[PDB]
Amino acid sequence: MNIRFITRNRHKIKEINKILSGTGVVVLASEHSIDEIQTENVHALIKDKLLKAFKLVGRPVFVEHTGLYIESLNGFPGGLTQIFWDKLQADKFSQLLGTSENPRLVAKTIIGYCDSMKIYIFEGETQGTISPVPKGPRDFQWDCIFIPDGESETFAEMGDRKNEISMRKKAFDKFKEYLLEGGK
Amino acid sequence: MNIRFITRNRHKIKEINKILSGTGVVVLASEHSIDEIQTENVHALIKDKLLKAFKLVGRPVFVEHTGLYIESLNGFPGGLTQIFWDKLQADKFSQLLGTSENPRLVAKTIIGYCDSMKIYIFEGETQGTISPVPKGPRDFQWDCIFIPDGESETFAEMGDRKNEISMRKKAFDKFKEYLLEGGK
Amino acid sequence: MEQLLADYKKGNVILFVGAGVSMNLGLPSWSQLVDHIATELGYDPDIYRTFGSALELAEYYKLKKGKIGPLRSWMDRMWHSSDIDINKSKVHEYIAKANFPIIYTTNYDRWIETALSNYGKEYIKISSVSDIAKIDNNKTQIIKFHGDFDDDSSIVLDETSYFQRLEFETPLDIKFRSDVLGKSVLFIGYSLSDINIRLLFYKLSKLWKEQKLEEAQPKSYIFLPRPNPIQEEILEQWRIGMISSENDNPGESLEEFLKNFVLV
Amino acid sequence: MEQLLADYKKGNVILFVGAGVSMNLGLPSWSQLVDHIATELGYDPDIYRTFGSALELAEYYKLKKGKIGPLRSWMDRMWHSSDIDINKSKVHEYIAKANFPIIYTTNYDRWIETALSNYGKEYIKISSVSDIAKIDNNKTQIIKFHGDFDDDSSIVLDETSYFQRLEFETPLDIKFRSDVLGKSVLFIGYSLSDINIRLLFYKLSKLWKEQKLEEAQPKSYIFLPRPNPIQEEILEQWRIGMISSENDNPGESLEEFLKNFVLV
Amino acid sequence: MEQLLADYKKGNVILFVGAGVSMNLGLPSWSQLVDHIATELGYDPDIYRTFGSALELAEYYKLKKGKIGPLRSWMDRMWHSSDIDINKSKVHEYIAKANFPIIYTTNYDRWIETALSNYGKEYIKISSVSDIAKIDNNKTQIIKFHGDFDDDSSIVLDETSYFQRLEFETPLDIKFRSDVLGKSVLFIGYSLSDINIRLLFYKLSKLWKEQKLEEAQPKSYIFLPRPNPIQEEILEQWRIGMISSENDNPGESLEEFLKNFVLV
Amino acid sequence: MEQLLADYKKGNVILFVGAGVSMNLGLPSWSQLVDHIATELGYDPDIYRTFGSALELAEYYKLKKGKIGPLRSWMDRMWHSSDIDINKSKVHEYIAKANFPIIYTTNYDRWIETALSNYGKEYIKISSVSDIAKIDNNKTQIIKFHGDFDDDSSIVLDETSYFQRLEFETPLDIKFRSDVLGKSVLFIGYSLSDINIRLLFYKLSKLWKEQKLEEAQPKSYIFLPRPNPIQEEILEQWRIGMISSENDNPGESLEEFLKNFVLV
Amino acid sequence: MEQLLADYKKGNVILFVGAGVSMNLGLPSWSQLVDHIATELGYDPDIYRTFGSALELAEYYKLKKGKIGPLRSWMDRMWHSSDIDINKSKVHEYIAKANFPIIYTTNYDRWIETALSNYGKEYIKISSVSDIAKIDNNKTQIIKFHGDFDDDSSIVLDETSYFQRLEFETPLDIKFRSDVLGKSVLFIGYSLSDINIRLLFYKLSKLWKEQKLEEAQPKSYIFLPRPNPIQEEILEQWRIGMISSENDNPGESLEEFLKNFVLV
Numbered sequence A, B: 001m002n003i004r005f006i007t008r009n010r011h012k013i014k015e016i017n018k019i020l021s022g023t024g025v026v027v028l029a030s031e032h033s034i035d036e037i038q039t040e041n042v043h044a045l046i047k048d049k050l051l052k053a054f055k056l057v058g059r060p061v062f063v064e065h066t067g068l069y070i071e072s073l074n075g076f077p078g079g080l081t082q083i084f085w086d087k088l089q090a091d092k093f094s095q096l097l098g099t100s101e102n103p104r105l106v107a108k109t110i111i112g113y114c115d116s117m118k119i120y121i122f123e124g125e126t127q128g129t130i131s132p133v134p135k136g137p138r139d140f141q142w143d144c145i146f147i148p149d150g151e152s153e154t155f156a157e158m159g160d161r162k163n164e165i166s167m168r169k170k171a172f173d174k175f176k177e178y179l180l181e182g183g184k
Numbered sequence C, D, E, F, G: 001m002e003q004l005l006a007d008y009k010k011g012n013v014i015l016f017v018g019a020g021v022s023m024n025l026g027l028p029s030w031s032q033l034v035d036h037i038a039t040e041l042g043y044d045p046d047i048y049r050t051f052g053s054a055l056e057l058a059e060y061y062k063l064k065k066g067k068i069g070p071l072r073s074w075m076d077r078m079w080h081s082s083d084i085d086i087n088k089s090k091v092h093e094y095i096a097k098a099n100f101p102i103i104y105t106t107n108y109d110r111w112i113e114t115a116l117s118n119y120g121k122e123y124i125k126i127s128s129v130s131d132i133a134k135i136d137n138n139k140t141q142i143i144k145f146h147g148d149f150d151d152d153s154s155i156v157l158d159e160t161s162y163f164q165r166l167e168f169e170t171p172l173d174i175k176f177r178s179d180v181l182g183k184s185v186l187f188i189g190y191s192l193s194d195i196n197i198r199l200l201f202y203k204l205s206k207l208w209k210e211q212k213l214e215e216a217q218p219k220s221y222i223f224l225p226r227p228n229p230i231q232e233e234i235l236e237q238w239r240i241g242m243i244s245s246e247n248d249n250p251g252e253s254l255e256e257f258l259k260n261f262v263l264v
């Protein structure tokens, strides 16, 4: 299956390519940096972004979105984590969110896929904890601060085994199950 | 001048009506809750929202947007302060942003106006300080936590004299100067 | 507006009715019809919105489904459900009680005829040339210009049907082309977007230009609640003036516009 | 003959008047017009009849003399001479006293309107689209289909004039093409020889055949005293029946035919 | 005629062939066809002639006999009998040996194609739109404009077929209307009496007058042996010049006219 | 698309060139023209794009500015700037080195003519009917169907211009309507969105159905890179097949498509 | 120079701009225009010089090419190429910074308006009478007296356009004929060779002679670098004095002449 991908993150392309390697499907990724909307419903937020990507391409195209949900912040981000990270980064993240009373937070990936006829939404989630100190490499955003639940290593420090338990994985496993199960 | 207004905030309508009272212009406000985009540029963020309001109305319509800019948070909000306030409110605002090393923050109002031919952008700003304790009435969002610079009273506690030094005022004074100076 | 009332009291104004009159009743809109076609063909609507506009969407539904018959059955059942009551419609009451001798419409529903028969006014419904043979001059002529739900071959909805109507060889086209000669047309609820009506009024303007009598052409009017200077200039080239209102609600604007016609 | 009176009392019969009605007033005939054109061009008539039919003879006069103006001036003076009295004409009296709402004519003379105004009946005379604007529904419409002597550009006499009228884009062509929709035409004094009228009724028959209600077309009638089975068959293909008379006098036959229409 | 030959060496002259070229061979005339129609319908010829011109007579034959098929069989057997030899025809030899790329004809007989196939000229016969698809640029286009004896539905003989050709929606009508744009037409054996050809050249003249370029319209020519100043003026309005000869025999006049085209 | 090459070596394929070919070149797009017109009329672009489609926006510029003279002047200067090199354009090179006898275009720029004169190929450029008179059969016909920057009256840009082209009475319209008779059209760079082209091919399809030979109609092809099943079905009804490419670059897809025609 | 500056600071000097102002920018000359006309008409330039002078040659290009449209398109593209920069022109800067209230020009290029908008000065461009309706008294008037590239009918290039302008019935001629009443005209880059301006100033001299007010006529001035006593005496009869320079460079002489006008 020849499915296209529109994004802004460049490392997201390499993660999706390494996850879907050897499956049979291929991804023709392109970089356009589609702006999202400020809404709480992630279904509408993935629906209009997939609409803008289908207006850009006109072929079968999928669209990913990834959201952190801080339980101490009453579930504030998710849909708008980008501006959050591109502002505070890692220095002003762990000193005021990793040292609070509730370090618990959940990270969700939602995939919106268009088969040039309909819109299909697949999602996956992992729970975790915010590190008090940033740890590991710092080339993929909030990977160096995200401790998953049941582990003591961040997703940047744990290496290539992050793409076996991560939420994007679960979401792309459901996406892969749909793509090899047929256009149902 | 008969100019229309599209918003979601209901108290914003009463503030704009009390500020523009006795001027000569009138405002026919309507409630639609237009979603914004997650962008840093506030000119594009007011331009597309005024585009959606002009697609909704088709008559001369202005659109306001109000952004807080926390200097401790590296200028994070502004364009997306709504979701911020709607998620963490006043309880999880002052305990982690009012007690830091840099309580300084600046609040900006940007007005996008369409005269059914062009797009006109007017803006105003006031600087201020975040309160360590929420103070005053709690019926207009971040008014009970915003200490302006050179004062010791919040904008909710100071009462009806908030509409003489506030940024929305400055922005609507430039808007009023344009609207009585003509369609230039 | 005053010359419109002077021509209306003389009896020289033809009423043209669009879908904006019928959207006050709670009928499905054009976008809901687009949605029904999209989920009937297996699409969701927003992904069928990037492909064509309206003619490509009714043409594609006709080509995949064979005919317009399932769609007409659905529009017949939805546009005439029992929840819609014509008695709480001030616009249809003002249309019925006014003295319009000839009424054209691009609606396929029968709510104009239902409103005329509710308030005790006799009429002749015209949708074929055999109904043109039944015209009485003491009764209202209601012409279903774009078809009715009684005949699938008469519904002008898709691109091929508009391509047939562009040649103006239909009897209803011939009747309209002579009815606009020397009579004013008042468009209510209508945006003048169908290409055959614009070509008809362009040819009428050309016709009055070839006789060197452009100042003597009757003037047409369109009531649009939302202003549009582009259309205003374009329709002013075809002697169609624009009447606008400052009310944001289109139904109450149309009520206040037709209040000048119902009374006396 | 009986169904014609049934449609006549219903008010669904259009009167079409040819030159044979005006032949009983003492007007110049068509052949006298040919003789006048031939003597004006330096010919003599019989040496000008081996060259062209008639459209060629009005076209050649227009081309040699520049315009149709001297011909229109001569036709205006001899067709309305003071020797002609409209009160001594039973055919025009039966036309005036009868009830025809719409009267068409291919004559350029004004004797139909003179007979209508002489016998105290109001009418609306239509020769331009600005006169289509003045149509009263309680008055007679007298449409000068082939022109009048008040306009040189309106007279349909020569070949280029009929070639212009073949496209059916004149306002009078559009008005006639919608008037024949659902109404019967009674041809008196007219031989149905003009090519645009035959093309108009051929396209009307094709239009009724395309809708597949060929039985429901209103039946037209032509009154010629001398019988012709060829025309009978050709006109019955266009739903135009022939009404003939055994009287050798054409004016008497027309008087006995219109006697059924003057009464009540 | 040096301008005609100068257009002829450039390949910008279309040959139009009428019934006189075929009448040189000894084929039955139009009068003999009208006589055969008359005695087939039970008339004697002359009384049948005093009923209609020729389109009404052929229309009456088609309406009484049902189709044109018995007539088509009779002209097929009479126009192609074994007594006619194409080798004893100098006119057809000069047509075949000339370099005319496009040849139109209103004849139904195949003597032009027989003449070109006799003298080794390769050609393409066009009587349908698939034959328009079979066009080669290095072969002579022979267009059977008024039909052929293979298809009864294509023969343009009676009034209804002339009306269908008057609408100009035939493929051959479209091909001719674009072939006359920027090419000269040379009429031989033809009188320019069919109303669809006259309307075609009238619309071509109106087309060149609309673009304000009537000085640059290509000049058409008609070779008539008997002079006619009326038609000379009328065809000169449509940029069709007249070539006349002093020889009383039309066959030898056409031979001497085509002598200028056969050589070199 | 093997049958496309089979008709290509015989010379029975007409090239139709749209606006995508004149885009690789770095010319201003259509939306840049919309932005220029909007800034010329005192608007800003999107506030002009919630009023009308495109024909309304050229019509409003022509009505506020009087003529399209400033618009033609700006389009003439920016569409033929000195920064554009025709040698660095593989699509125009593949167009020029191919052997297309007849090339149609809807561009007003002269880059097709510049590409063919640059690569040593002679051509005849057709924009009026005198250039139809200048047609050589051993040279490429480049027909500027929607106009040129030399004539303001020829540019088909606004709604009135498209209405005049919808009448199909232009010489270029008649030439195209007979060129599509029996030849295949290859659309490159073109979306088949102009209503006069769609009505032309609809009438061509109706023409081939009226002869009952619609299986023998020549098959047209359109090359669009992004696929569209709605257009595929609708153009498949008019005998226009879709050729799509999996490449996301439109210029590269057009280069690999026209590489099959550039060789031998 | 003294009385010229004295009438300048009162605001009573009209600036007239010819081609020699615009020749500093690297624009094509008049001779290169004649070379392009000769190349486009198949001539070589030097033989083409020996037939007419300028007006007959532009007349021949218009008559052979139909209209002036290809020449206007070429003149529009080469007169406004991207290599021409208005900031490196001290003549246009000295024109723009000067407060001339009325500016006339016979150039069809927009470099005066480009220089006026480039140096921050508001203007109103006049090329028709609807632009005369928009004259503001606090803005400078730029009048394109011999036309602009936005209108084919306005360009005064060939002898027919000069013959139309000789009658002084265009709105711009009446505007100029009243603007020269009681105002001084300063000619820069202009040789006073056009027949309409010489006849206009001859009629102005006759007008000041007929009122017995020859001494009270305002003095016009013309700046040519090369001294001509013949033009000096002939223009002195029309009260147009000569300003001459000793510098051989015409651009530097023009800059030194306009140095008195740019200052304060």
Ligand SMILES: O=c1nc[nH]c2c1ncn2[C@H]1C[C@H](O)[C@@H](COP(=O)(O)OP(=O)(O)OP(=O)(O)O)O1
Residues within 6 Å of the ligand: A006, A007, A008, A009, A033, A034, A064, A065, A066, A067, A079, A081, A082, A085, A140, A141, A142, A143
């Ligand atoms: O596995 C991850 N590990 C650490 N950080 C991550 C990860 N996945 C997303 N992120 C961060 C980067 C992105 O800036 C932000 C917003 O997520 P997200 O909206 O889906 O990506 P994006 O906005 O940056 O690019 P795009 O235009 O395709 O939506 O979350």
Ligand SMILES: O=c1nc[nH]c2c1ncn2[C@H]1C[C@H](O)[C@@H](COP(=O)(O)OP(=O)(O)OP(=O)(O)O)O1
Residues within 6 Å of the ligand: B006, B007, B008, B009, B033, B034, B064, B065, B066, B067, B079, B081, B082, B085, B140, B141, B142, B143
């Ligand atoms: O004077 C103010 N004092 C305290 N809080 C304020 C004020 N003005 C805005 N605010 C808060 C309320 C709003 O939720 C948030 C976003 O500002 P803002 O985007 O412009 O208003 P909104 O999103 O809630 O309604 P709308 O759809 O018209 O944009 O900032």
Ligand SMILES: [Mg+2]
Residues within 6 Å of the ligand: A034, A035, A036, A082
């Ligand atoms: Mg994003």
Ligand SMILES: [Mg+2]
Residues within 6 Å of the ligand: B034, B035, B036, B082
């Ligand atoms: Mg908001």
